[PDB]
Design a protein around this motif. Sequence first.
Motif, mmCIF file in Angstrom:
data_model
loop_
_atom_site.group_PDB
_atom_site.id
_atom_site.type_symbol
_atom_site.label_atom_id
_atom_site.label_comp_id
_atom_site.label_asym_id
_atom_site.label_seq_id
_atom_site.Cartn_x
_atom_site.Cartn_y
_atom_site.Cartn_z
ATOM 1 N N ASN A 18 0.613 -1.145 -0.053
ATOM 2 C CA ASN A 18 -0.190 -0.280 -0.402
ATOM 3 C C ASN A 18 1.031 1.447 -0.083
ATOM 4 N N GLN A 19 1.247 1.716 -1.051
ATOM 5 C CA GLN A 19 1.696 3.174 -1.238
ATOM 6 C C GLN A 19 0.779 4.268 0.086
ATOM 7 N N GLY A 20 -0.156 4.621 0.281
ATOM 8 C CA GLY A 20 -0.694 5.117 1.253
ATOM 9 C C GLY A 20 -0.877 6.586 0.805
ATOM 10 N N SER A 21 -0.563 7.899 1.094
ATOM 11 C CA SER A 21 -0.943 8.921 0.511
ATOM 12 C C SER A 21 -0.349 9.378 -0.466
ATOM 13 N N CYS A 22 1.171 8.792 -0.959
ATOM 14 C CA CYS A 22 2.435 9.467 -1.460
ATOM 15 C C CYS A 22 1.967 9.239 -2.839
ATOM 16 N N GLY A 23 2.979 10.388 -3.433
ATOM 17 C CA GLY A 23 2.115 9.713 -4.738
ATOM 18 C C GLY A 23 3.682 8.651 -5.067
ATOM 19 N N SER A 24 4.017 7.950 -4.842
ATOM 20 C CA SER A 24 5.396 6.517 -4.899
ATOM 21 C C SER A 24 4.770 5.691 -5.450
ATOM 22 N N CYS A 25 3.378 5.796 -6.764
ATOM 23 C CA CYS A 25 3.089 4.248 -7.139
ATOM 24 C C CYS A 25 4.355 3.534 -7.919
ATOM 25 N N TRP A 26 5.241 4.714 -8.806
ATOM 26 C CA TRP A 26 6.708 5.123 -9.853
ATOM 27 C C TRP A 26 7.298 3.544 -9.881
ATOM 28 N N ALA A 27 7.765 3.941 -7.751
ATOM 29 C CA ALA A 27 8.489 3.341 -7.113
ATOM 30 C C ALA A 27 8.197 1.401 -6.944
ATOM 31 N N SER A 60 12.961 10.899 -10.517
ATOM 32 C CA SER A 60 11.415 11.547 -9.494
ATOM 33 C C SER A 60 11.377 12.122 -8.770
ATOM 34 N N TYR A 61 10.070 12.883 -8.463
ATOM 35 C CA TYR A 61 10.285 13.757 -7.400
ATOM 36 C C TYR A 61 9.493 13.440 -6.475
ATOM 37 N N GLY A 62 9.430 12.174 -5.554
ATOM 38 C CA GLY A 62 9.385 11.924 -4.649
ATOM 39 C C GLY A 62 8.104 11.475 -4.533
ATOM 40 N N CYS A 63 7.689 11.633 -3.733
ATOM 41 C CA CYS A 63 6.011 11.588 -3.180
ATOM 42 C C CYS A 63 5.059 12.725 -4.514
ATOM 43 N N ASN A 64 5.518 13.631 -5.188
ATOM 44 C CA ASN A 64 4.697 14.296 -6.352
ATOM 45 C C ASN A 64 4.997 13.494 -7.691
ATOM 46 N N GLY A 65 5.369 12.003 -7.484
ATOM 47 C CA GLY A 65 5.299 11.461 -8.309
ATOM 48 C C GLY A 65 6.545 11.478 -9.413
ATOM 49 N N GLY A 66 6.192 9.966 -10.448
ATOM 50 C CA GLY A 66 7.991 9.354 -10.802
ATOM 51 C C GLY A 66 7.945 8.937 -11.935
ATOM 52 N N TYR A 67 9.079 8.424 -12.274
ATOM 53 C CA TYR A 67 8.962 7.451 -13.414
ATOM 54 C C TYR A 67 9.743 6.506 -13.471
ATOM 55 N N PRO A 68 8.657 5.089 -13.583
ATOM 56 C CA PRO A 68 9.365 4.023 -13.576
ATOM 57 C C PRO A 68 10.291 3.321 -14.286
ATOM 58 N N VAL A 132 3.888 -0.944 -15.678
ATOM 59 C CA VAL A 132 3.691 0.004 -16.445
ATOM 60 C C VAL A 132 2.514 0.326 -15.644
ATOM 61 N N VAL A 133 1.709 1.079 -16.982
ATOM 62 C CA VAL A 133 1.102 2.397 -16.237
ATOM 63 C C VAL A 133 -0.708 2.270 -17.298
ATOM 64 N N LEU A 134 -1.299 3.060 -16.063
ATOM 65 C CA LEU A 134 -2.724 3.393 -16.215
ATOM 66 C C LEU A 134 -3.531 4.597 -15.474
ATOM 67 N N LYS A 156 -5.033 8.460 -19.937
ATOM 68 C CA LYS A 156 -4.811 10.244 -19.532
ATOM 69 C C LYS A 156 -3.715 9.490 -18.288
ATOM 70 N N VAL A 157 -2.344 8.266 -18.591
ATOM 71 C CA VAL A 157 -2.598 7.619 -17.594
ATOM 72 C C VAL A 157 -1.599 7.968 -16.225
ATOM 73 N N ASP A 158 -1.610 7.838 -15.536
ATOM 74 C CA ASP A 158 -1.377 8.453 -13.978
ATOM 75 C C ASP A 158 -0.834 7.660 -12.915
ATOM 76 N N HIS A 159 -0.445 6.418 -13.173
ATOM 77 C CA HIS A 159 -0.631 5.560 -12.006
ATOM 78 C C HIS A 159 0.048 4.243 -12.380
ATOM 79 N N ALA A 160 1.344 3.900 -11.367
ATOM 80 C CA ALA A 160 1.821 2.804 -12.163
ATOM 81 C C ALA A 160 1.690 1.938 -11.970
ATOM 82 N N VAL A 161 1.884 0.986 -12.337
ATOM 83 C CA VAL A 161 1.788 -0.882 -11.536
ATOM 84 C C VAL A 161 2.556 -0.786 -11.927
HETATM 85 C C1 LIG Z 1 1.107 7.982 -9.136
HETATM 86 C C2 LIG Z 1 1.043 7.544 -7.745
HETATM 87 O O1 LIG Z 1 1.650 7.273 -6.610
HETATM 88 O O2 LIG Z 1 -0.198 7.454 -7.443
HETATM 89 C C3 LIG Z 1 1.759 9.110 -9.053
HETATM 90 O O3 LIG Z 1 1.160 9.636 -8.838
HETATM 91 C C4 LIG Z 1 2.784 9.185 -10.529
HETATM 92 O O4 LIG Z 1 4.360 8.804 -10.406
HETATM 93 N N1 LIG Z 1 2.498 9.105 -11.572
HETATM 94 C C5 LIG Z 1 2.982 9.538 -13.191
HETATM 95 C C6 LIG Z 1 2.171 9.031 -14.152
HETATM 96 C C7 LIG Z 1 2.537 7.505 -14.653
HETATM 97 C C8 LIG Z 1 4.165 6.666 -13.702
HETATM 98 C C9 LIG Z 1 2.238 7.762 -15.693
HETATM 99 C C10 LIG Z 1 3.535 10.922 -13.140
HETATM 100 O O5 LIG Z 1 3.022 11.786 -12.919
HETATM 101 N N2 LIG Z 1 4.838 11.179 -13.487
HETATM 102 C C11 LIG Z 1 5.711 12.399 -13.245
HETATM 103 C C12 LIG Z 1 6.032 12.768 -12.123
HETATM 104 C C13 LIG Z 1 5.322 15.037 -12.030
HETATM 105 C C14 LIG Z 1 6.011 14.834 -11.010
HETATM 106 N N3 LIG Z 1 6.054 16.734 -11.001
HETATM 107 C C15 LIG Z 1 6.272 17.974 -10.430
HETATM 108 N N4 LIG Z 1 6.973 18.620 -11.269
HETATM 109 N N5 LIG Z 1 6.428 17.416 -8.975
#
Ligand SMILES: *[C@@H](C(=O)O)[C@H](O)C(=O)N[C@@H](CC(C)C)C(=O)NCCCCNC(N)=[NH2+]
Length: 212
Positions: A18-27, A60-68, A132-134, A156-161
Amino acid sequence: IPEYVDWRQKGAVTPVKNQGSCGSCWAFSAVVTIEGIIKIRTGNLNEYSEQELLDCDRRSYGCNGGYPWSALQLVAQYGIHYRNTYPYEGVQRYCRSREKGPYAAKTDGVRQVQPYNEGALLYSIANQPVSVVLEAAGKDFQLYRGGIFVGPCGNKVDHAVAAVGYGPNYILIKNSWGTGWGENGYIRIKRGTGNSYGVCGLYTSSFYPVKN
Ligand SMILES: *[C@@H](C(=O)O)[C@H](O)C(=O)N[C@@H](CC(C)C)C(=O)NCCCCNC(N)=[NH2+]
């Protein structure tokens, strides 16, 4: 490749996280693929540190998202610690790789699946779990409880799984939303619909680690 793949049955998938509230799905996605390829290549199933990628993946941007892709490149160039050594905190911290002793595992690179190509993704999943992303923002995905998920969803992919298997009509996805979401933490997403993006954009951007 066979009609069914399920890396859980081959002992290549650790418990659902469970990633919790952190936007760490990519990791989490990257780590699922690392745990899988290390099991496939060495015979041992270990848990590796999502937190390490969160802290140390500078692209990557920590809990603000990132790139698998970027987390997997981090594991191939440096390495990754066991989850026990570098446990998940749900918040980005200082990179502590250097203070946690030698890496536990190392990969040799990162391939990308040819995007927008179902068979290419299926071919890779037959070899290993794939990042993969979705699009997970749609309430249908958020509220998913079970069955072969067909949407509604956009691309409109936004979530790494992580894709850890497939069947005749679905691709099997390990999500990082805990064991209470979906099918004990998994979702089976319909495939074979002829939409090049994949259901929920599932074919948009897929990466897997390479380990010789
Ligand atoms: C996903 C999650 O944790 O639920 C998380 O928001 C994430 O990493 N999303 C990715 C998109 C998918 C991997 C396609 C994402 O947004 N990656 C780029 C990071 C954007 C953050 N940029 C800044 N400047 N904060």
